[PDB]
Scaffold this active site. Structure first.
Site: not given
Ligand code: TI2
Ligand code: CA
Ligand code: CA
Ligand code: CA
Ligand code: CA
Ligand code: ZN
Length: 316
Positions: A142-143, A146, A157, A166, A183, A226, A231
């Site tokens: 995820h990071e 970005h 953003y 996001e 998993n 936010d 998010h």
């Protein structure tokens, strides 16, 4: 650091043993020379000054509890680099093999991880809400995604472009999780979130509403919290992505899934070719339809499924 490339062994946040690529020069450094210009992991030492010190170890064995977050941040950045190279033919986040840097042990009890425009940063969590954030591969992917976004679409953003920014990170974080086949699921942060509660996660792509996030445009957050709900409103796009891949009926609209691989192909194309810094939800739909058209033809099922998925979440 200039030294000899070697392989160390350690234990990650979840207690799993893995081999990591290190560099030797007096000490063994968390410096992986086998991928692009390198992957470097730093120790922030519970402070906020970045990047901190390039991780040094005396014996190339990383089994101390302090080591755990470093092992995973270093290891997962490599897996994520591999995904982008092998699946999308992208060399690192900038497409030109830029060095990937991550700092762990950032601050004290910090419940977050982020891309700061230069590197990735991971807190250790407070032990309740989160355990060290690099222990989750969907977090690391995820990071790093970005970074990819920064060098491509440059989605601002805030508000809708921020929610897209996001969602792209959640979508690719999930595709990387499936890629490593750790998993895999369509849940976000299940591996590092709330160590006391099992079966939960921070967000859900399959069902955003499970954790209070909107699964339809009519339910989007319109406030200022936010960064305008980046998010929160991402749940709408996450739901659409999930539908495109897996299919299903949402709010009476039926979507035939086309699978994860084509989902990744369509979104990567939209991100790198059509999205701009100010793109909104409606423009993302147009970008996604255009990308599926480029790749599969306007009369393809793939184009049809993208349309149904966005119709399903109320994005016209
Ligand atoms: O909303 C966020 O920032 C949450 C952290 C959070 C959530 C609930 C909570 O009670 C406390 C903290 N962060 C994120 O979703 C993810 C981390 C994560 C990914 C996947 C899975 C789990 C966690 N981080 C972000 O989105 C970073 S990119 C947001 C950010 C931007 C700039 C500066 C600081 C932080
Ligand atoms: Ca050691
Ligand atoms: Ca999982
Ligand atoms: Ca997950
Ligand atoms: Ca949990
Ligand atoms: Zn993020």
């Amino acid at each position: 650091i200039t030294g000899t490339s070697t392989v160390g062994v350690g234990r990650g946040v979840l207690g799993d043993q893995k081999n990591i690529n290190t560099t030797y020069s007096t000490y063994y450094y968390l410096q992986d020379n086998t991928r692009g210009d390198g992957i470097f992991t730093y120790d922030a030492k519970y402070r906020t000054t970045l990047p901190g010190s390039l991780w040094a170890d005396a014996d190339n064995q990383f089994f101390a509890s302090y080591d755990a977050p470093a092992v995973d941040a270093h290891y997962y950045a490599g897996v994520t680099y591999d995904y982008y190279k092998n699946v999308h033919n992208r060399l690192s986040y900038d497409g030109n093999n830029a060095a990937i840097r991550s700092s762990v042990h950032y601050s004290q009890g910090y419940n977050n991880a982020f891309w700061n425009g230069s590197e990735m940063v991971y807190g250790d969590g407070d032990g309740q809400t989160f355990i060290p954030l690099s222990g989750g591969i969907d977090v690391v992917a995820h990071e790093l995604t970005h970074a990819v976004t920064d060098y491509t679409a440059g989605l601002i953003y805030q508000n809708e472009s921020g929610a897209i920014n996001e969602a792209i990170s959640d979508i690719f974080g999930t595709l990387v999780e499936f890629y490593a086949n750790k998993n895999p699921d369509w849940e976000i942060g299940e591996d590092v979130y709330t160590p006391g509660i099992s079966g939960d996660s921070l967000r859900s792509m399959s069902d955003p509403a499970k954790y209070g996030d909107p699964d339809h445009y009519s339910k989007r957050y319109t406030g200022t919290q936010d960064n305008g709900g980046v998010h929160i409103n991402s749940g709408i796009i996450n739901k659409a992505a999930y539908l495109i891949s897996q299919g299903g009926t949402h709010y009476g609209v039926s979507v035939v899934g086309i699978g994860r691989d084509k989902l990744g192909k369509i979104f990567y194309r939209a991100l790198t070719q059509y999205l701009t810094p100010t793109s909104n939800f409606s423009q993302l739909r147009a970008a996604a339809v255009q990308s599926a058209t480029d790749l599969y033809g306007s009369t393809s099922q793939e184009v049809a499924s993208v349309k149904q998925a966005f119709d399903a979440v109320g994005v016209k």
